[PDB]
Amino acid sequence: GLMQFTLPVRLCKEIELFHFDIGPFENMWPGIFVYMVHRSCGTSCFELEKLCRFIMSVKKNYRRVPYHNWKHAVTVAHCMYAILQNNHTLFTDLERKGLLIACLCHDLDHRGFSNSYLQKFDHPLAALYSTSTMEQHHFSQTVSILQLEGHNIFSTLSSSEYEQVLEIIRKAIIATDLALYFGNRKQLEEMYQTGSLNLNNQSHRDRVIGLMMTACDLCSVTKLWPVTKLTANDIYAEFWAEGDEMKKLGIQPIPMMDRDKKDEVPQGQLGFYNAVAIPCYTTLTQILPPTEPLLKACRDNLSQWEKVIRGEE
Numbered sequence: 001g002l003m004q005f006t007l008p009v010r011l012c013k014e015i016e017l018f019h020f021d022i023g024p025f026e027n028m029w030p031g032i033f034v035y036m037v038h039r040s041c042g043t044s045c046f047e048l049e050k051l052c053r054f055i056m057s058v059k060k061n062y063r064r065v066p067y068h069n070w071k072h073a074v075t076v077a078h079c080m081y082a083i084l085q086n087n088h089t090l091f092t093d094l095e096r097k098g099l100l101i102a103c104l105c106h107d108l109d110h111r112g113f114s115n116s117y118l119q120k121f122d123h124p125l126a127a128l129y130s131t132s133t134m135e136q137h138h139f140s141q142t143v144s145i146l147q148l149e150g151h152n153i154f155s156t157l158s159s160s161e162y163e164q165v166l167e168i169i170r171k172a173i174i175a176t177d178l179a180l181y182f183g184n185r186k187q188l189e190e191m192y193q194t195g196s197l198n199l200n201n202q203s204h205r206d207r208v209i210g211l212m213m214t215a216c217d218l219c220s221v222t223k224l225w226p227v228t229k230l231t232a233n234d235i236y237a238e239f240w241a242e243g244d245e246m247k248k249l250g251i252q253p254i255p256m257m258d259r260d261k262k263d264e265v266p267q268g269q270l271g272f273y274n275a276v277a278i279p280c281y282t283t284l285t286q287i288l289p290p291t292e293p294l295l296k297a298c299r300d301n302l303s304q305w306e307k308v309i310r311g312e313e
């Protein structure tokens with residue numbers, strides 16, 4: 001009850017910043033997550049024993065893939081922590097509870113393959129979930145783990161509060177399907193510009209949380225350059241393995257996933273910054289002004305990819 005997690009001084013200070021990198025010491029990541037729940041939510045939000053058991057079963061259900069792994073889960077949860085801590089009074093008690101868990105769980109049991117690849121392979125998951133295939137699976141794995149004996153971290157919530165938190169988690173996890181991000185961001189653009197955006201309107205809050213989820217999910221482009229550039233290698237290690245698997249089904253993959261087209265990566269990163277990342281953080285910054293550092297860091301990385309193209313690195 002009187003038992004805080006504390007971090008060494010460098011981590012205690014830097015964990016508060018958006019560009020924080022959780023480090024290569026896997027055994028410190030559970031403690032970093034508990035630290036973030038305790039400061040974001042409270043020491044009372046969850047029974048410590050249940051939370052620790054939940055975290056460790058979540059870890060066990062992430063796979064040893066190059067990018068969509070336990071380190072990504074915790075990294076996406078830290079970006080949500082930073083957003084929440086910089087927007088103290090905008091979010092409900094249930095939202096603070098749900099969103100860190102949603103982020104920890106958002107890629108549960110990812111195999112390193114896109115929704116597209118599952119549909120072309122004709123994976124059983126693509127017949128069970130026709131759109132947002134992996135994201136409905138991630139939500140299903142989250143409910144599975146919440147239902148294991150001793151793993152119900154929400155046990156103190158009423159029936160209707162429990163239903164509300166699981167609904168916040170479902171929508172937050174579905175929103176990490178980047179196919180749904182383009183339309184969500186356009187509606188948020190129109191709503192903000194015509195002044196109709198209303199944070200008491202639940203369907204509006206849902207949209208804003210969806211955009212927060214995209215921003216956290218993509219937060220590798222908001223790190224200091226050496227972190228962003230080394231993370232890119234892990235992202236492409238998966239894309240290129242998917243490319244190989246498309247070639248095995250007799251399908252020329254898109255260039256993004258074709259290892260023969262490594263040379264075109266810098267221009268590919270430019271498209272992604274310009275079509276996805278910058279717009280994401282720009283709209284987030286308009287809605288939630290204290291998230292501006294995410295946008296500033298993204299623009300710094302865009303300018304580094306521009307330097308790569310110009311052979312200045």
Ligand SMILES: CCc1cc(C(=O)Nc2ccn3nc(-c4ccccc4)nc3c2)cc(Cl)n1
Nearest residue numbers: 217218219220221255256261264265268269272
């Ligand atoms: C799983 C989602 C995800 C994706 C990315 C990412 O880097 N995306 C993207 C987008 C689009 N192209 N096009 C290319 C490309 C095009 C032609 C030739 C070679 C390459 N390369 C990417 C890379 C970053 C993060 Cl943080 N999460």
Ligand SMILES: [Mg+2]
Nearest residue numbers: 106107176177
């Ligand atoms: Mg995902």
Ligand SMILES: [Zn+2]
Nearest residue numbers: 106107176217
């Ligand atoms: Zn993710």
